[PDB]
Symmetry: C2
Subunit: 234 residues, 2 copies
């Protein structure tokens, strides 16, 4: 019933990479809930989701493990316990989440549509968040994020050249200052993510005139993207 579209990318080994499609938030979830069951009042459903989030946040922050159909969560601690004390600069709380029974059951009814390899050797293969060590394209605002790929060097004179973040919620495009691209290699980019960015999903785009391998710069810039979740600055 369900279909996941996947690219073949270099790991070296070949690995599957989910195709860039869509991001959905609470507003779209509420629209789809009302479309599936027109007997539910949107305002009641919106209230219910906020209420449930309050209950779960409070449970996790008061040391309970929480299990829903979608996930299981528990509060965790990050950083070394320096001098048998909590240091707000090195230590932090986070909630570790694992897929729940409803997701494991939905996976059973899902097939993978292999798209093959991308037609051009220009893409974002993988990523890593410095702070959380996550590789699922979740990231931390005001901290470093590494992009691994092919022919990613930010180069050229054209004004569109550079790294951008486009908000899935508002559509607003934030350009990353070129000084904040602290490593600019064809197979790897290290960027500092702006601290002011609101939590949510963004479209990360590398636009460059850098030609694959050696040679002259491309006359017109080319773009490659990947979805990314940015969690607010710690």
């Amino acid at each position: 019933k369900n279909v996941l579209k996947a690219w073949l990318v270099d790991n070296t080994d070949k690995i599957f990479q989910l195709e860039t499609t869509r991001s959905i938030d609470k507003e779209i979830i509420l629209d789809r809930m009302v479309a599936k069951n027109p007997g539910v009042r949107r305002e009641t459903m919106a209230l219910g989701i906020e209420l449930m989030e309050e209950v779960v946040a409070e449970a996790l922050m008061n040391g309970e493990s929480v299990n829903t159909g979608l996930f299981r969560g528990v509060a965790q601690f990050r950083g070394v316990a320096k001098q048998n004390a909590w240091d707000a600069a090195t230590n932090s709380i986070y909630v570790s989440l694992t897929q729940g029974k409803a997701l494991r059951e939905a996976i059973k009814d899902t097939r993978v549509d292999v798209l093959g390899e991308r037609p051009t050797k220009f893409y974002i293969g993988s990523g890593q968040d410095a702070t959380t060590r996550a590789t699922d394209f979740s990231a931390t605002a005001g901290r470093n994020f590494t992009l691994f790929g092919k022919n990613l060097t930010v180069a050229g004179t054209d004004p569109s050249v550079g790294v951008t973040l486009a908000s899935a919620a508002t559509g607003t495009v934030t350009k990353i200052d070129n000084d904040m691209i602290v490593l600019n290699e064809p197979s790897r980019l290290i960027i500092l993510l702006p601290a002011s960015l609101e939590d949510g999903e963004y479209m990360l785009t590398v636009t460059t005139q850098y030609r694959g391998g050696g040679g002259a710069l491309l006359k017109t810039p080319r773009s490659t993207s990947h979805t990314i979740y940015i969690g607010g600055a710690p």
Copy 2:
């Protein structure tokens, strides 16, 4: 000050780490009861229907390759294993959903203080854990697969028939004893176990019962027990 409090122990990792003192485990039934308790304006049956409806929409969105964000989490489908002959192989490749905390949890973390209790009173406890399949260290585990327990004086030893590793279901209270031969590594600071495949998804209380005495010494006349909560995810396909 901070409206939430987390209690944490200082356990061994040459250096020390923080270990949450877990309060209890809650499911959809308790969540729904607490929602009604906070807002008597809502009808519990309407809230229960809404949660099933929200889960269906989120599960369909994820399984059709969309990234999903709520205030509690962001999710996206991910793939495991190498591409053999540039084609999906159901016997070596798998799908999972990677989940990260959302904005509501990040804001709640801001109103939370950590109350350090110091070091654990006894030198017999479960400090940390690791799932072999996912490599998760949050005490989430995979049924039919290996799990590692790190701690102090965890060696399973003694003549008493109660000695061993058990899992008690939070949903029913049903206890599953792991066969002693499914204890693959039996060291004081680390146990490697094979989890049975038939375990239903959910939270369990994992208990290590043993007559093994701290460091050097004769076996204890009476067995002692130490526990840790564990989430078990259903066996892989």
